[PDB]
Design a protein around this ligand. Sequence first.
Ligand code: ANP
Ligand code: MG
Lengths: 168, 155
Amino acid sequence: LRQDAVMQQVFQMCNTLLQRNTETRKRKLTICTYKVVPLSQRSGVLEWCTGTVPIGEFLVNNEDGAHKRYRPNDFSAFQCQKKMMEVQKKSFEEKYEVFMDVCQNFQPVFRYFCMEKFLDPAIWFEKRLAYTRSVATSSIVGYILGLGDRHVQNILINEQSAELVHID
Amino acid sequence: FLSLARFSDTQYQRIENYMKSSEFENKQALLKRAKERYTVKVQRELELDELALRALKEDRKRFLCKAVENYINCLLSGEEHDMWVFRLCSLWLENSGVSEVNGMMKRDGMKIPTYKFLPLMYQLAARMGTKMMGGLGFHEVLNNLISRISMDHPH
Ligand SMILES: Nc1ncnc2c1ncn2[C@@H]1O[C@H](COP(=O)(O)OP(=O)(O)NP(=O)(O)O)[C@@H](O)[C@H]1O
Ligand SMILES: [Mg+2]
C-alpha cells in the first residue's frame, strides 16, 4: 500500500498546483483523493470512499446493469466479453472487425446516471459539468504521470457529487 | 505526390524510431528475463510478441514502399522539389535488402532525369559493389543508374 500512498501524495501536489492557478481554480479542477496508511510490507489500511460505486458495477452488472436495463435487445456484457476473448488469438484485422461489431450492438447508456439521480435540471447540469471537469482533469493527470490499468473496477464514481475517483 | 510521400515517410520514421526506442529494448529484455503454467504463458508471450513484431515489420515495409513510390512519382512529376532525391536515396540505401524497393527503383527511377542525382554523385559512387549483383539486386541497379548518369553528364 505504500505505492498507493505515494500516488495519493502526488495527486495532492497536482491538486495544490491546480488550486493556485486562477484558470483551474475558477473551474474547480481537482483530483479526488483518499487517505492510505500503510502498516507493514504486506498489510495496510486505507480510506473507503463512502457513497461511491464502481463504474463497471453500475454499467455492466449482470443482474441490474445499466446496459441491461436500458438496452435489453443489445448484446449482453458476457456475450461481448466472450466474443473479445475468442478473437484474442487471431489477426489484428479480425480483432478490429470484432471490436467494431461489438460496438455496433453495444450502445453507451452512461448518460442516464445523472438523469436518474438528479431530476432537477439545475442540479443535473451542475453534476454533469462537475463530472466532465473531473474526467478531463483526471485524464490529464493520469497521462502526465503515465497512469495505467484504468479498467472499470479501478474507477469509482461518487453518487452525491458525480466525481470520478481513481483507485489501484 | 510530395504530400503523400512526406506522410508515408513520417509514418515509417515513427515506426523505425519505435523499433529503436529504449522502450522496445526494455520490453524485449523483460520478456527474455521472464522466459528464463509458467511454460504455457512463456510460450504464449514468445508467440504473441513475434506476431506483433511480424505485423509491425509488415506495416513498416508497406509504408516504406509507399513512401519510395510516392517520392519517385513526385520527382517525375516536377522539378520544384528536387531536393527530396536525397531522401529517396537515403531510403534506398538504408533499405537495399528489400526486393520491392529495388524493383521499384529499377522500373521507375531510370525515367528520372540524371541531373537530379548529380549533387549526391559522391554518395552514389561510394556504394558501388559486386557481391550482390543480379536481376533485382541493388548493386546492378545502382551500377546501371550510375552509368546512365555518367553517359548523360560525363563532365
Ligand atoms: N478506497 C476504496 N474506496 C472504496 N471502494 C474501494 C476502495 N478500494 C477498493 N474498493 C472496492 O474494492 C473493489 C476491489 O478493488 P481492490 O480492493 O483494489 O481489489 P483488487 O481488485 O483485487 N486489486 P489488487 O489487490 O490490486 O489486485 C473495487 O471494485 C471497489 O469496489
Ligand atoms: Mg482493482
